[PDB]
Design a protein around this ligand. Structure first.
Ligand SMILES: [Zn+2]
Ligand SMILES: [Zn+2]
Ligand SMILES: [Zn+2]
Ligand SMILES: [Zn+2]
Lengths: 697, 6, 697, 6
């Protein structure tokens, strides 16, 4: 059922967990560094879990897609072919920025955080800055022990703050990926849909130094030896059975003003989906004629397709449930309720009117803001802005440097510049620069940027042409030139004739003032959000509704049972798909082009000891009424005994709007069955070594 | 797929 | 499950009936003129049943569609608005050709029939004529008792013959029809489809003379008092529950040569579907501008739509189950099995060869024969040819007149001529003539008919226009002119300057020769068909398969249980639909424009005492694994206690290919729930007088 | 609908 419960809410959900079928004690689940919770890891944007005592980690294909792609070329395409390392020595680096985060400790720091906030007094910019300083100090302290990364999380509009401390494994290697026609069977046609038939899994191995401490990649590192790892279920998972997930959902917006919904629905999602679709169309066409462009842009293309389709889905789900109506109506209900308490509900009512005005202010510049941000995110402009800004920050003492430009951020910065080599082709990036310059000149007069207008010198195709021809002069297209500037000083940037660097230096003052404007807005939000959100939780409680904080990239537990759903009168989706359903979709064309070994195994009923008698085949994917979102891909699905029965990987089409208005009848997790992972690894793309390592071969 | 939005 | 069982097979299915849940004794079902089997009537082309002791008859909306359409005008459109007679004197005539046939007696005449056939000797044409002569005598004898119509049926390729005698009620009146948006909710979009939300019902009342004897329409007639009528269930029908249907399925082709299947799939269905879709398009376009053409052609259009979609669905089902391959393999197995019997198999092997040759003979002229038949079935050419042929036949003694042109056929002929008044617009028929002239002109030289070529006197668009201009001078457009010619003699037709009559006179000798070819082929078929089909039956039984004759418009029983089906992996269709599903499909545009009273009643959850608590709503339609086909529309569905639980009205999309190769997993009946008939008549288009008459008020 | 073919 509903709820992305924080682990501090386990007393509230102990009974419901029991009633739904959990056979472990809640005490055992509460042990976040214990068995099995302690085996669950964060990848940073996806979840994973340890599945052997030798540091073997399982996640989804889409979570490992970047790593797979980084290691792929046009002539050796691992996305297409899969990967299998017969021995740990054959494992390839998942990339310098790949991470495994193993939870160490959580601490409530709520009192101190809002003390530090209050001390800045009635000044918005100063309030943001006071929180920044407070967070940096806490993290510096927490990170004093080598090998740990810490993060401060704000829950429930800033009513609660927690600091998480994680072991940061920095040498992650790819151990296995099934062929793309299994890991991503159905491609973008089946994405966000049920029936689903996708082997959405892949494996990494976590490595540390010989002293057991974290370290960046070296052939001298060795597999990490985790305290806790998951075991595969020995009982067959069936319809109605208890399941739970623990993982790292990124964001939800279920506590939102109605106007924040309306903006998102009428502007944000249609605008971003359009832009994403145009870029997809350009890269698709270029890649049809250029296998290098096609491999190099594959991960970027997967993200554009995934988010644009998700937004189309949320738009359609809003209409299906009248989300716009429900938000309006429940807000009316809430505002009603506050004034009915007279003296008591004046603070909350004030907060609402403040939040509303903050929203109108961001709204005044949203076109400018988005377009500028996306233009500056093309590869050469992004590298130059980031590298120039770093050179500016490096002049300050480290504690005053902007988050993301501090010493602790250097590894990821340098890692990104390297990974870009496998994700950049000048001819293609030029087309994207062209796109965004065209979208920029389209902007109205108010909404323009001084500095970009001057740099461009004209509002027509001629200026665009000249701008493009100029930037093509940059030397930042090579990894080595990027790394040179990663070490260079500010003076050296401002001296450069490199036209990307010149662009960066030209716009940075504007970027810094826009960042001040954003930090000032966020400071006034910091006053007002926690009050109004606290009222919203209060109202919900008074209606007996479930109360848990929106997702924020921290660890959450969701539980329920395996079950289908009914999209329309006269029909039901069954809880499982089966092998036979994979082959029925076969076309011999991408994305429905399973390996021959799979087609042959299914025709011959080679079920590998994995058949579930209740469905007459090996299960492939299944539905359950868990409450997951972006970030949860890769999360292990545990049964009543805490055993691995699957991995979370997607949501059915009608679920996606639950990011804003939760709908229990149409909200289901799509999971890949543990037995299907095993099956692929026995019969289709074999990895007998990993099965043995997991005690299942 | 529930990767973190792009 | 499978099987359109004849009543004489009851001993064989008594076990199965009991096992599936029938609580009546098999003896009680054996009495075809008792309770409840005596309540089941043929309309035919559809089935119906009595539901009150005062001659109320319930059937489907599609079955009463012609009747409703005959009583409709553009200004007063009963198809759209419904009809309801508050008292029996308000009932309107269903048309002179409407009929209720009540079963009186079935007699096996097999021995006699076969003796009459053998007496003809070696000549194919004589063999046809001998059987015709036998049939006419038998029927004349049977119909000596006034008020009765008799029909001779051949089963299993001529291995069995039975004579049916029916009471023939000739004054049928429309008592009630729901509005078209209930009767045909979802139109052609939902036709042949599940999920289904269609109130597929209507009521007639059967009338006889004051002397109790059948009579044509007169205000002195009174309601017929049936011996038996059905009663509505007092127990709620649920998933898994036993159901049975009795009715009059028209034709199936499960016993057929591979080649007959191949010709049908490759040429018959696609050809007919194309011609029908072309005519639809013209009439649809024309009716958009002229509401008189829209109403007058609506019943024709319903049939073109229904058959063309059916054929599309058969073609798709053949591909789904590889019907061509199944037929080929099954035939290779029968032909092997015959060869293996040496001497005694030879007659069937020989019969097969003769049947294949007869199909090839048919095939050589199929395009000519179809195109000519359909050109001549436009309204004025059809009237002229029929009437001119009648004039030819009237000069012979009655016993030698062609069936369809005997004295016993005059009422139907005359009634047809009158009904056409409500189904003909000159400017529309002209476009249909032009279509068929353009199709004629595409025929190759060796498929052309000298009489039509000469009459046309050209082969281009100019000639076509000249011919249409000539035909437009006919006077057969009026009912009175058609009846004048109904009574006129042959010489009067041959002297006429009416251009449609002239056409008929010119082509008649050619039609008569083609008829003789068909009669000749049919006589060879009479020799070969029984022998091969018996072998087919014998082979099926040696394989343990169900053995029952193809449908042939005679009374059959089918039984099974309420159940859904699974169209593909990860999905099931549920057995029922519900009221909320009807409203979920609302668009406010035909064919999804339910009456406002329906929309209101559902929104207010007014369930009228009819809620099935297991589905949380009033049920609308349901699925079952019964074996029905064209002709079964309107058949009562009975429960374990022989009570009415719905009416058969359609098949799901995948079921329609079962006319050639039966697929148990995807063949379901779609039926309208008795509760939904009652619900509509309570809350939406009320008929309290009818509900009271059926003891459900 | 299972009326007679047309
Ligand atoms: Zn147990
Ligand atoms: Zn350089
Ligand atoms: Zn006249
Ligand atoms: Zn009973």
């Amino acid at each position: 059922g509903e709820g992305m419960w924080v682990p501090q809410q386990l007393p509230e959900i102990a009974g419901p967990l029991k009633k739904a079928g959990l056979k472990l004690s809640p005490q055992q689940i509460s042990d976040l560094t214990g068995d099995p919770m302690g085996a669950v890891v964060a990848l940073g944007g996806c979840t994973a879990s340890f599945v052997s005592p030798n540091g073997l980690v399982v996640t989804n294909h889409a979570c490992a897609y970047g790593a797979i792609q980084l290691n792929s070329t046009a002539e050796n395409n691992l996305i297409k072919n899969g990967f299998n390392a017969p021995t740990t020595a054959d494992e390839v680096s998942a990339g310098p920025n790949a991470r495994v985060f193993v939870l160490d400790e959580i601490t409530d720091v709520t009192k101190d955080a809002k003390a530090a906030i209050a001390a800045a007094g009635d000044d918005a910019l100063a309030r943001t800055k006071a929180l920044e300083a407070f967070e940096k100090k806490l993290i510096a302290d927490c990170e004093a022990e080598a090998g740990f990364r810490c993060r401060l999380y704000s829950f429930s509009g800033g009513n609660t703050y927690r600091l998480f401390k994680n072991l940061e494994i920095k040498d992650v290697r790819l151990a296995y990926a099934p062929p793309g026609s299994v890991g991503k069977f159905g491609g973008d046609i089946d994405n966000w849909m049920w029936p689903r038939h996708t082997g959405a899994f892949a494996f990494y191995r976590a490595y540390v130094g010989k002293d057991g401490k974290p370290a960046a990649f070296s052939k001298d590192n060795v597999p990490y030896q985790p305290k806790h790892w998951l075991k595969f279920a020995d009982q067959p998972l069936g319809a109605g059975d208890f399941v739970m997930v623990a993982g790292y959902p990124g964001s939800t917006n279920r506590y939102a003003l109605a106007a924040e919904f309306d903006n998102t629905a009428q502007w944000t999602y249609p605008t971003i989906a359009r832009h994403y679709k145009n870029q997809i169309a350009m890269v698709e066409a270029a890649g049809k004629q250029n296998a290098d462009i096609q491999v190099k842009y594959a991960a970027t293309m997967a993200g554009w397709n995934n988010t644009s389709k998700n937004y189309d889905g949320q738009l359609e789900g809003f209409k299906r449930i009248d989300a716009a109506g429900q938000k309006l109506r429940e807000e009316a209900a809430v505002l009603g309720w506050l004034k009915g308490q007279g003296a008591k509900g004046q603070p909350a009512l004030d907060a609402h009117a403040k939040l509303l005005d903050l929203l109108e202010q961001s709204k005044a510049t949203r076109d400018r803001d988005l377009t500028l941000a996306l233009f500056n995110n093309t590869a050469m402009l992004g590298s130059a802005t980031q590298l120039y800004r770093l050179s500016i920050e490096r002049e300050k003492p480290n504690a005053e440097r902007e988050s993301g430009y501090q010493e602790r951020d250097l590894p990821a910065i340098e890692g990104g510049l390297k990974q870009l080599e496998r994700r950049y082709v000048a001819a293609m990036d030029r087309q994207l620069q062209e796109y965004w310059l065209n979208e920029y000149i389209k902007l109205p007069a108010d909404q323009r940027v001084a500095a970009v207008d001057a740099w461009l010198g004209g509002n027509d195709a001629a200026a665009v042409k000249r701008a493009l021809d100029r930037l093509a002069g940059t030397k930042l297209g090579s990894t080595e030139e990027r790394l040179k500037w990663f070490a260079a000083d500010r003076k050296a940037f401002e001296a450069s004739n490199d036209p990307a660097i010149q662009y960066a230096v030209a716009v940075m003052p504007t970027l810094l003032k826009l960042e001040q404007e954003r930090k000032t807005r966020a400071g006034e939000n910091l006053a007002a959000r926690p009050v109004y959100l606290q009222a919203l939780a209060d109202y919900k409680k008074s209606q007996g509704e479930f109360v848990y904080p929106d997702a924020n990239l921290s660890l959450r537990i969701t539980f329920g049972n395996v079950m289908g759903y009914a999209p329309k009168d006269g029909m039901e989706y069954t809880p499982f798909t089966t092998l036979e359903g994979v082959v029925a979709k076969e076309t011999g064309q991408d994305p429905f082009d399973s390996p021959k070994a799979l087609l042959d195994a299914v025709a011959a009923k080679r079920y590998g000891g994995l058949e579930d008698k209740r469905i007459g085949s090996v299960p492939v994917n299944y539905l359950s009424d868990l409450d997951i979102t972006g970030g949860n891909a890769g999360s292990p699905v545990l049964d009543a005994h805490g055993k691995l029965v699957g991995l979370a990987f997607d949501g059915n089409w009608e679920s996606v709007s639950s990011n804003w208005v939760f709908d229990p009848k149409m909200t289901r997790m799509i999971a890949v069955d543990g037995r299907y992972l095993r099956w692929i690894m026995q019969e289709v793309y074999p990895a007998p070594q990993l099965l043995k390592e997991m005690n299942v071969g | 797929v529930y990767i973190h939005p792009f």
